Amino acid sequence: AWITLEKAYEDAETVTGVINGKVKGGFTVELNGIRAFLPGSLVDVRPVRDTLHLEGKELEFKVIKLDQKRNNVVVSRRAVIESENSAERDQLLENLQEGMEVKGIVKNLTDYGAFVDLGGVDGLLHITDMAWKRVKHPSEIVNVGDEITVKVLKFDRERTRVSLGLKQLGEDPWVAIAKRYPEGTK
Numbered sequence: 001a002w003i004t005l006e007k008a009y010e011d012a013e014t015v016t017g018v019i020n021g022k023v024k025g026g027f028t029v030e031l032n033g034i035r036a037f038l039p040g041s042l043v044d045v046r047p048v049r050d051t052l053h054l055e056g057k058e059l060e061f062k063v064i065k066l067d068q069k070r071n072n073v074v075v076s077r078r079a080v081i082e083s084e085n086s087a088e089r090d091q092l093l094e095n096l097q098e099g100m101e102v103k104g105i106v107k108n109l110t111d112y113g114a115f116v117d118l119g120g121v122d123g124l125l126h127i128t129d130m131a132w133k134r135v136k137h138p139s140e141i142v143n144v145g146d147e148i149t150v151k152v153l154k155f156d157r158e159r160t161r162v163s164l165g166l167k168q169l170g171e172d173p174w175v176a177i178a179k180r181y182p183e184g185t186k
Helices: 002-011 080-095 173-180
Strands: 015-023 028-031 036-038 060-069 074-075 100-112 113-117 120-127 149-157 161-165
Touching: 002 015, 028 074, 080 120, 100 120, 120 149
Parallel strands: 036 074, 120 161
Antiparallel strands: 015 028, 015 060, 028 036, 060 074, 100 113, 100 149, 113 120, 149 161
């Protein structure tokens, strides 16, 4: 099995595997007795809110990384997912959508930011920038699969990543404070 997964890493082979469980960062797959990890942002082209149907199904994965030292292989639904996303990443790379303003669907929420799919690029929408308010948890404002319009603060071309912000639609209250609250106000 270990020789099998190493060749499929070299040969880019499609291997059948069973997803044994889902964790906060992805799904656990088993391939010929070797433990695989499917990243949450890499599970499917559609951010299907009902992930329960993905548990226990035999599905094919492409070996991205084989770790001899840890007995774990990181797989994603590759082959199929990589050529389409390169064209779409290039399209977003060429369009840049008036400073990357785009409707996006939140694939997964993390405690330091939200993963928002803009159709090819991964954005971290930080809890600080989800709203002007210092929210303790992103889960109350945006649910997995909600469409939010977010404005990009930073575009990382080399990693095909965008840093997102929601604050910029809400008129900056600090500039209003300069007009609302002079020094000395109780």
